[PDB]
Design a protein around this ligand. Structure first.
Ligand code: HEM
Ligand SMILES: Cc1ccc(C(=O)O)cc1
Ligand SMILES: [Cl-]
Length: 393
């Protein structure tokens, strides 16, 4: 009853252009079986949303990558939040929610905005830049490690560590094997920075450790929760901001609308998150036999959720392949949905908003003026190099 497909959603050919294969996955049926990796797949909005919002049946504690923690050893100690189910998930989640809370955004917004304005000013002096290394990477590197409270030395490990984390959600292909092979110095750096004495006062890391006396987390839980922010907090925003600049470079009509009303900056970023879906996929594991669509999935099966496909499903979205900065984006699953929905979404949106605001106010044109190069990762979608000419307003 369930169609079997040979599509490999973790192949370089798929990463290079996923959209035809994602339509094939959607149109084959509400639930597919991917023979390449022996997992179920859901690529329509409806089933992705349903799976995300039933954490009891579609659990996370057996891993949200291909590997089943009941069968294989995790490559690193499980995340106390991402790779936990209720009730164990609940108090670590509440702590990170308060650490990255609406009130916390007020303390960092002025500095994040000034750094975004300063970066665009700097880039406009050069004119021809790489919007990945010089903007999408450079701006988050200029605000997020400091907001964490990290020392300066060793920050070159942060993007490699995150690339490793997101590759390690994938199947055991070359991208994953190579990442793990090179992982030891990056894990050593990251694990050391998670310890309380190495996190500067007032930053996100110190605030996590400060929550260890409320009864929500114990002291021995704080390093792994810092680890979660050092895993998820930087590379995601790099590819979110890169996606937004890539969209504005490809759709100049939308750059023109954004210039005319810079208060569209926040929704222009949100639409970029829907349109590119920097985090493409996550897995769940069934805790029981379950009916989904019309298929009966057995217990202990991996289910691959295509977040990017769900965000382009024409059953849910009008003109899904169009970048529209005034679109009603509410309900997109680029940040997830339900109990695990991105706890750092306010940081991500703040960074994206203030960068797009700086562009909206300072830049008249963004023209691709060099070869575009894609960056390949088992979970992240984004570019390696995006040469652009910035024309000042
Ligand atoms: C454009 C930027 C980002 C995107 C697209 C993104 C994507 C996601 C997604 C899809 C999930 C759901 C995971 C699941 O359902 O299994 C998630 C969760 C999470 N994100 Fe974000 N993320 C972004 C930025 C950030 C930032 C900036 C931080 C921290 C500062 C962060 C920290 C986390 C954490 C800790 C979780 C786990 C939450 C939980 O399991 O309850 N993320 N993210
Ligand atoms: C997207 C993402 C990646 C890693 C983590 C973590 O807890 O390590 C959380 C969320
Ligand atoms: Cl690690």
């Amino acid at each position: 009853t369930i169609p079997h497909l040979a599509i490999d959603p973790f192949s370089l050919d798929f990463f290079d252009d996923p959209y035809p294969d994602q339509q094939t996955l959607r149109d084959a049926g509400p639930v597919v079986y991917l023979d390449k990796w022996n997992v179920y797949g859901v690529a329509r909005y409806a089933e992705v949303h349903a799976v995300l919002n039933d954490p009891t049946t579609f659990c996370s504690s057996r891993g949200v990558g291909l590997s089943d923690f009941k069968k294989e050893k995790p490559w690193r100690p499980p995340s106390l939040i991402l790779e936990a189910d209720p009730p164990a998930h609940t108090r670590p989640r509440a702590v990170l929610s308060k650490v990255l809370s609406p009130a916390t955004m007020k303390t960092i917004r002025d500095g994040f905005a000034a750094a975004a304005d300063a970066k665009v000013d700097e880039l406009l002096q050069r004119g021809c830049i790489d919007a990945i290394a010089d903007l999408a990477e450079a701006y988050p590197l200029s605000v997020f490690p400091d907001a964490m409270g990290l020392k300066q030395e060793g920050r070159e490990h942060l993007l490699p560590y995150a690339g490793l984390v997101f590759n390690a959600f994938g199947p055991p292909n070359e991208l994953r094997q190579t990442a793990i092979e090179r992982s030891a110095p990056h894990q050593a750096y990251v694990n050391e920075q998670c310890q309380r004495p190495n996190l500067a006062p007032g930053g996100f890391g110190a605030c996590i450790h400060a929550f260890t006396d409320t009864g929500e987390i114990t002291p021995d839980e704080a390093p792994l929760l810092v680890r979660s922010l050092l895993s998820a907090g930087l590379d995601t925003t790099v590819n979110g901001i890169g996606a937004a600049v890539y969209c504005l470079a490809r759709f100049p009509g939308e750059l023109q609308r954004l210039r005319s009303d810079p208060t569209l900056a926040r929704n222009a970023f949100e639409e970029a998150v829907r349109f590119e879906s920097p985090v493409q996929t996550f897995f769940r594991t069934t805790t029981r036999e379950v009916e989904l669509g019309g298929a009966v999935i057995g217990e202990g099966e991996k289910v691959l959720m295509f977040l990017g496909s769900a965000n382009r499903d024409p059953r849910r979205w009008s003109d899904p392949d169009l970048y529209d900065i005034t679109r009603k984006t509410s309900g997109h699953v680029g940040f997830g949905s339900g109990v695990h929905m991105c706890v750092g979404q306010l940081v991500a949106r703040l960074e994206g908003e203030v960068m797009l605001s700086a562009l909206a106010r300072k830049v008249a044109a963004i023209d691709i003026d060099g070869p575009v190069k894609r960056r390949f990762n088992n979970t992240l979608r984004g570019l390696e190099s995006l040469p652009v000419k910035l024309t000042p307003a």
